[PDB]
């Protein structure tokens, strides 16, 4: 109980401290300095705090910077991956072979040319042929091209 109460009374005191900025690391320098873009304007180089291994501040990660004399003092949860954001914007509906129906030979061909090179890159090596890297899908609109690409 006493620890709880003391925690509250020090809470009132330590909540008046300046809030810490959040900036995205773009590149890590030597001598314990990191290039950080602080939201929404400003690109600084901040000395890392002596509690964070600079090896963990890999580019494109959110980090807290102390209010006065910006000092990376915490690695916040990583920002949404740019690819994740791009795919969320595009919103290609998720697909699977069971949702696909009526084009089984086409499933087989796309399976060969996509599945096998990445899963079994030894069949092609034994055959002596370069792994296929380009697929083109003929067909009128809405016949399952994007569906099959997403499913594979």
């Amino acid at each position: 109980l006493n620890a709880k109460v003391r925690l509250l009374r020090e809470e009132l005191q330590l909540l008046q401290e300046q809030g810490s900025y959040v900036g995205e690391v773009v590149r890590a320098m030597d001598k314990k300095k990191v290039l950080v873009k602080v939201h929404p304007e400003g690109k600084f180089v901040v000395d890392v705090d002596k509690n964070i291994d600079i090896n963990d501040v890999t580019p494109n990660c959110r980090v807290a910077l102390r209010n006065d004399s910006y000092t990376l003092h915490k690695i916040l949860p990583n920002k949404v991956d740019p690819l994740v954001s791009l795919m969320m914007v595009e919103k290609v509906p998720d697909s699977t072979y069971e949702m696909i129906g009526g084009l089984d030979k086409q499933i087989k061909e796309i399976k060969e040319v996509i599945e096998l090179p990445v899963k079994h890159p030894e069949l092609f090596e034994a055959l002596g042929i370069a792994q296929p890297k380009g697929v083109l899908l003929y067909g009128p609109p809405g016949t399952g091209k994007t569906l099959l690409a997403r499913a594979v």
Binding site: E98, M99, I100, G101, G102, L103, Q106, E109, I110, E112, V113, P132, K133, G134, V135, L136, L137, Y138, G139, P140, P141, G142, T143, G144, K145, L147, L148
Partner: protein, 51 residues
């Protein structure tokens, strides 16, 4: 179209009668279908249609 780039060209023609029936079954799985619906009849009634 140069024969060195598109390692494979697949063709997705308009669904056959059987393909249309399969598509109709797949896309009707997700609704209350009253018992005994002739999805084959519906597929036949809609020729030359895409998925």
């Amino acid at each position: 179209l140069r024969p060195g780039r598109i390692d494979r060209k697949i063709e997705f023609p308009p669904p056959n009668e059987e393909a249309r029936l399969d598509i109709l079954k797949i896309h009707s799985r997700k609704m209350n279908l009253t018992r005994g619906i002739n999805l084959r009849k519906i597929a036949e009634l809609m020729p030359g249609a895409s998925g």
